[PDB]
Design a protein around this ligand. Sequence first.
Ligand SMILES: [Cl-]
Lengths: 173, 175
Amino acid sequence: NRDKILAAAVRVFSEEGLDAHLERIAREAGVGSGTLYRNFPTREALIEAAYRNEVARLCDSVPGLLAELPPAEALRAWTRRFIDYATAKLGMADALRAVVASGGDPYGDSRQLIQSALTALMDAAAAAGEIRSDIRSTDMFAALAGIALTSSRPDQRAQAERLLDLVLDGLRP
Amino acid sequence: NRDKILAAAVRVFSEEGLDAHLERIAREAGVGSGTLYRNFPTREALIEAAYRNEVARLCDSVPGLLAELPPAEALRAWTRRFIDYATAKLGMADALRAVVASGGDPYGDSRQLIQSALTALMDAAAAAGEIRSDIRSTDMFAALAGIALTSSRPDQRAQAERLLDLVLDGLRPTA
Ligand SMILES: [Cl-]
């Protein structure tokens, strides 16, 4: 419902930019525009909420991934989700740029939250002996950030996947 | 510098709500007020950032706590940090309201982030056999929230510690 509105926000802001038709987001989410407005009264609030929700969905996937997969495989799956997040962030670049230029702070403590999710994955994989234990999570984060910077476009997805494979291979015991 | 400002903001807004003077926050953070205005050009932007920082610090303590303590004791230490957060939240009630009434949203996905931190703690403690595995993290969240609502005054400190003990005892395994 909320997740539906904010998923729709990512899509519509990515396609239409800052000037997106808000009624389109409501309708795609199967919701009235009064409902959209009661929850997200300004377009900047909606943009920021959509960004924050991408961040939270990425971070909050970790316990479930660790529950279902061996920890190095959990880390690998999560790195794909990190690129999905990067591709989303890039998709709504014009919208996020506008919120910042108008005085907003969509980002807040997102970098720390994402770093901590990575630390949780890497501590579990290192404890299991599935990865080396001497790599810092802050350096892995920088590696993923660079792959985001070079390879976040939808058309760069194969290169992004191969670069993720290379960095994950750098973690091998 | 930012962590300092934001920590000071939470402290001052939770104590004084909207009577908070920005000069007091700058002072406690040890920074010049121009520096504070440069970074947070609006009182509501300061309040929102302070709240979000408080949530993220609470969530991000989980890996480190699980690295240093047996997982049920990690859970216990973190639940005290949760009550610290929820007490601050209650104290910042007027300030958080003012962020809303200007069309902003301090809360975002905070509930989800904090519930997930709780899930991480409870998953580890159940895997280790140190707690039962059949309690829901949304229920544990509501239990801790309730303690913050009943037992937030400085004179209720000991009660809050006893309620935390009671809730953690409800988590005890069969064997
Ligand atoms: Cl944040």
